[PDB]
Symmetry: C2
Protein backbone atom coordinates (compact mmCIF):
# COMPACT_ATOMS: atom_id res chain seq x y z
CA UNK A 1 0.00 0.00 0.00
CA UNK A 2 1.15 3.56 -0.78
CA UNK A 3 2.38 5.70 2.12
CA UNK A 4 -0.81 7.80 2.43
CA UNK A 5 -2.98 4.64 2.83
CA UNK A 6 -0.67 3.38 5.56
CA UNK A 7 -0.95 6.69 7.47
CA UNK A 8 -4.70 7.13 6.84
CA UNK A 9 -5.58 3.51 7.81
CA UNK A 10 -3.60 3.71 11.03
CA UNK A 11 -5.14 7.11 11.88
CA UNK A 12 -8.73 5.78 11.42
CA UNK A 13 -7.93 2.55 13.40
CA UNK A 14 -6.66 4.83 16.21
CA UNK A 15 -9.67 7.20 15.99
CA UNK A 16 -12.36 4.44 16.05
CA UNK A 17 -10.57 2.42 18.77
CA UNK A 18 -10.51 5.53 20.94
CA UNK A 19 -14.12 6.43 20.00
CA UNK A 20 -15.52 2.98 20.92
CA UNK A 21 -13.45 2.45 24.10
CA UNK A 22 -12.50 5.76 25.83
CA UNK A 23 -13.84 8.82 23.99
CA UNK A 24 -12.59 11.37 26.57
CA UNK A 25 -9.12 10.44 25.24
CA UNK A 26 -9.98 11.71 21.71
CA UNK A 27 -8.09 15.03 22.38
CA UNK A 28 -4.79 13.33 21.50
CA UNK A 29 -5.55 13.19 17.73
CA UNK A 30 -6.75 16.80 17.45
CA UNK A 31 -4.88 20.11 17.80
CA UNK A 32 -6.14 23.29 19.49
CA UNK A 33 -7.43 24.87 16.24
CA UNK A 34 -9.13 21.66 14.95
CA UNK A 35 -12.64 21.99 13.55
CA UNK A 36 -15.50 19.47 13.81
CA UNK A 37 -18.78 19.50 11.95
CA UNK A 38 -21.03 16.89 13.66
CA UNK A 39 -24.34 16.35 11.84
CA UNK A 40 -24.28 19.96 10.53
CA UNK A 41 -23.33 21.60 13.88
CA UNK A 42 -19.87 23.13 14.01
CA UNK A 43 -17.65 22.63 17.05
CA UNK A 44 -14.50 24.81 17.03
CA UNK A 45 -11.31 24.06 18.86
CA UNK A 46 -10.11 21.08 20.89
CA UNK A 47 -11.96 21.89 24.13
CA UNK A 48 -15.37 22.15 22.34
CA UNK A 49 -14.71 19.04 20.24
CA UNK A 50 -13.69 16.88 23.22
CA UNK A 51 -16.66 18.17 25.29
CA UNK A 52 -19.15 17.36 22.50
CA UNK A 53 -17.82 13.81 21.84
CA UNK A 54 -17.48 12.99 25.56
CA UNK A 55 -21.07 14.13 26.26
CA UNK A 56 -22.85 12.13 23.52
CA UNK A 57 -25.70 10.28 25.24
CA UNK A 58 -24.78 6.60 24.71
CA UNK A 59 -22.78 4.33 26.93
CA UNK A 60 -21.54 1.82 24.38
CA UNK A 61 -20.79 2.55 20.74
CA UNK A 62 -19.23 0.32 18.13
CA UNK A 63 -18.29 1.33 14.60
CA UNK A 64 -17.55 -0.79 11.62
CA UNK A 65 -15.99 0.57 8.44
CA UNK A 66 -17.48 -0.52 5.16
CA UNK A 67 -15.14 1.44 2.88
CA UNK A 68 -12.16 3.76 3.47
CA UNK A 69 -10.53 5.93 0.78
CA UNK A 70 -7.30 7.90 1.33
CA UNK A 71 -5.47 10.58 -0.67
CA UNK A 72 -2.38 12.79 -0.41
CA UNK A 73 -2.82 16.54 -1.05
CA UNK A 74 -0.31 18.89 -2.75
CA UNK A 75 0.57 20.66 0.55
CA UNK A 76 1.55 17.49 2.46
CA UNK A 77 -1.81 16.60 4.06
CA UNK A 78 -3.81 13.34 3.91
CA UNK A 79 -7.57 13.18 3.31
CA UNK A 80 -9.33 10.06 4.67
CA UNK A 81 -12.95 9.32 3.79
CA UNK A 82 -14.96 6.54 5.51
CA UNK A 83 -18.36 4.99 5.03
CA UNK A 84 -19.56 2.63 7.74
CA UNK A 85 -22.11 1.43 10.22
CA UNK A 86 -22.36 2.04 13.92
CA UNK A 87 -24.30 0.66 16.81
CA UNK A 88 -24.94 2.65 19.96
CA UNK A 89 -26.33 0.78 22.97
CA UNK A 90 -29.66 -0.80 21.90
CA UNK A 91 -30.55 1.56 19.09
CA UNK A 92 -30.76 0.09 15.62
CA UNK A 93 -27.69 0.03 13.39
CA UNK A 94 -27.11 3.29 11.53
CA UNK A 95 -24.98 4.08 8.48
CA UNK A 96 -22.50 6.97 8.71
CA UNK A 97 -20.15 9.09 6.60
CA UNK A 98 -16.98 10.60 8.02
CA UNK A 99 -14.10 12.63 6.59
CA UNK A 100 -10.77 13.57 8.12
CA UNK A 101 -8.06 16.03 7.05
CA UNK A 102 -4.72 15.00 8.54
CA UNK A 103 -1.57 17.14 8.84
CA UNK A 104 1.93 16.38 10.04
CA UNK A 105 2.52 18.81 12.93
CA UNK A 106 5.56 18.34 15.18
CA UNK A 107 6.50 15.02 13.53
CA UNK A 108 3.08 13.39 14.21
CA UNK A 109 -0.08 13.11 12.17
CA UNK A 110 -3.03 14.94 13.75
CA UNK A 111 -6.57 15.63 12.56
CA UNK A 112 -7.28 19.27 11.75
CA UNK A 113 -10.68 18.94 10.12
CA UNK A 114 -13.43 16.39 10.91
CA UNK A 115 -16.87 16.07 9.34
CA UNK A 116 -19.51 13.50 10.40
CA UNK A 117 -22.96 12.74 9.01
CA UNK A 118 -25.42 9.89 9.63
CA UNK A 119 -26.85 8.17 6.55
CA UNK A 120 -30.62 8.70 6.49
CA UNK A 121 -33.14 5.91 5.98
Amino acid sequence: KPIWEQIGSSFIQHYYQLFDNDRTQLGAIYIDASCLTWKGQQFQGKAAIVEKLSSLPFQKIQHSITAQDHQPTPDSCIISMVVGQLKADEDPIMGFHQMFLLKNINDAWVCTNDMFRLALH
Copy 2:
Protein backbone atom coordinates in the same frame (compact mmCIF):
# COMPACT_ATOMS: atom_id res chain seq x y z
CA UNK B 1 -21.17 39.92 8.60
CA UNK B 2 -23.23 36.75 7.95
CA UNK B 3 -22.01 33.79 5.82
CA UNK B 4 -18.35 32.94 6.09
CA UNK B 5 -16.36 33.09 2.85
CA UNK B 6 -15.55 29.33 2.71
CA UNK B 7 -19.29 28.50 2.85
CA UNK B 8 -19.89 31.03 0.05
CA UNK B 9 -17.11 29.66 -2.16
CA UNK B 10 -17.70 25.99 -1.28
CA UNK B 11 -21.46 26.13 -1.96
CA UNK B 12 -21.11 27.91 -5.30
CA UNK B 13 -18.30 25.46 -6.26
CA UNK B 14 -20.62 22.47 -5.44
CA UNK B 15 -23.50 23.91 -7.48
CA UNK B 16 -21.21 24.62 -10.45
CA UNK B 17 -19.51 21.17 -10.29
CA UNK B 18 -22.86 19.22 -10.32
CA UNK B 19 -24.36 21.47 -13.04
CA UNK B 20 -21.32 20.74 -15.18
CA UNK B 21 -21.39 17.04 -14.14
CA UNK B 22 -25.10 16.59 -15.05
CA UNK B 23 -25.15 18.65 -18.30
CA UNK B 24 -21.79 18.10 -20.02
CA UNK B 25 -18.98 16.37 -18.14
CA UNK B 26 -16.27 17.05 -20.78
CA UNK B 27 -16.31 20.65 -19.45
CA UNK B 28 -15.16 19.39 -16.00
CA UNK B 29 -11.45 19.93 -16.88
CA UNK B 30 -11.68 23.66 -15.99
CA UNK B 31 -12.06 22.95 -12.23
CA UNK B 32 -9.08 20.59 -11.97
CA UNK B 33 -5.39 21.27 -12.46
CA UNK B 34 -2.53 19.02 -13.52
CA UNK B 35 -1.69 18.01 -9.94
CA UNK B 36 -5.36 17.14 -9.15
CA UNK B 37 -6.30 13.78 -7.74
CA UNK B 38 -9.53 11.75 -8.18
CA UNK B 39 -10.57 8.57 -6.34
CA UNK B 40 -13.71 7.18 -8.03
CA UNK B 41 -15.12 4.16 -6.16
CA UNK B 42 -11.72 3.16 -4.71
CA UNK B 43 -9.66 3.68 -7.90
CA UNK B 44 -7.11 6.51 -7.86
CA UNK B 45 -6.62 8.73 -10.96
CA UNK B 46 -3.65 11.19 -10.86
CA UNK B 47 -3.70 14.33 -13.01
CA UNK B 48 -6.16 16.38 -15.04
CA UNK B 49 -5.96 14.39 -18.29
CA UNK B 50 -6.54 11.02 -16.53
CA UNK B 51 -9.44 12.49 -14.45
CA UNK B 52 -11.22 13.96 -17.45
CA UNK B 53 -10.90 10.73 -19.47
CA UNK B 54 -12.33 8.62 -16.59
CA UNK B 55 -15.31 10.99 -16.07
CA UNK B 56 -15.98 11.25 -19.83
CA UNK B 57 -15.95 7.44 -20.16
CA UNK B 58 -18.64 6.59 -17.55
CA UNK B 59 -21.42 4.52 -19.15
CA UNK B 60 -24.45 6.70 -18.30
CA UNK B 61 -26.28 8.88 -20.78
CA UNK B 62 -28.30 10.91 -18.28
CA UNK B 63 -27.22 11.75 -14.76
CA UNK B 64 -28.85 13.84 -12.07
CA UNK B 65 -27.46 14.64 -8.68
CA UNK B 66 -29.40 15.89 -5.73
CA UNK B 67 -27.67 17.12 -2.61
CA UNK B 68 -29.05 16.10 0.77
CA UNK B 69 -26.35 17.80 2.80
CA UNK B 70 -23.18 19.86 2.17
CA UNK B 71 -20.63 20.72 4.89
CA UNK B 72 -17.74 23.23 4.33
CA UNK B 73 -14.70 24.13 6.45
CA UNK B 74 -11.55 26.26 6.07
CA UNK B 75 -8.28 24.30 6.39
CA UNK B 76 -5.12 25.63 8.12
CA UNK B 77 -3.22 26.26 4.84
CA UNK B 78 -6.06 28.40 3.39
CA UNK B 79 -7.90 25.69 1.48
CA UNK B 80 -11.62 24.94 1.56
CA UNK B 81 -12.66 21.35 2.35
CA UNK B 82 -16.19 20.23 1.51
CA UNK B 83 -18.23 17.06 2.22
CA UNK B 84 -21.37 16.25 0.25
CA UNK B 85 -23.98 13.53 0.93
CA UNK B 86 -26.74 13.09 -1.65
CA UNK B 87 -28.60 10.91 -4.11
CA UNK B 88 -28.01 10.25 -7.76
CA UNK B 89 -30.22 9.07 -10.53
CA UNK B 90 -28.54 7.77 -13.64
CA UNK B 91 -30.59 6.64 -16.63
CA UNK B 92 -33.17 4.04 -15.48
CA UNK B 93 -31.04 2.68 -12.68
CA UNK B 94 -32.38 2.80 -9.16
CA UNK B 95 -31.64 5.92 -7.12
CA UNK B 96 -28.38 5.46 -5.24
CA UNK B 97 -26.89 7.33 -2.29
CA UNK B 98 -23.40 8.80 -2.71
CA UNK B 99 -20.80 10.69 -0.73
CA UNK B 100 -18.25 13.10 -2.22
CA UNK B 101 -15.42 15.23 -0.85
CA UNK B 102 -13.69 18.21 -2.52
CA UNK B 103 -10.52 20.03 -1.43
CA UNK B 104 -10.33 23.51 -3.00
CA UNK B 105 -7.33 25.79 -3.41
CA UNK B 106 -7.06 29.34 -4.73
CA UNK B 107 -4.59 29.43 -7.62
CA UNK B 108 -4.31 32.53 -9.88
CA UNK B 109 -7.32 34.27 -8.26
CA UNK B 110 -9.52 31.17 -8.89
CA UNK B 111 -10.64 28.30 -6.69
CA UNK B 112 -9.60 25.00 -8.22
CA UNK B 113 -10.14 21.43 -7.04
CA UNK B 114 -6.98 19.61 -6.12
CA UNK B 115 -8.56 16.51 -4.48
CA UNK B 116 -11.86 14.79 -5.31
CA UNK B 117 -13.18 11.54 -3.81
CA UNK B 118 -16.46 9.85 -4.75
CA UNK B 119 -18.10 6.69 -3.49
CA UNK B 120 -21.56 5.12 -3.99
CA UNK B 121 -23.52 3.86 -1.00
CA UNK B 122 -24.23 0.18 -1.66
CA UNK B 123 -27.60 -1.40 -0.91
CA UNK B 124 -27.31 -4.07 1.80
CA UNK B 125 -29.23 -7.05 0.34
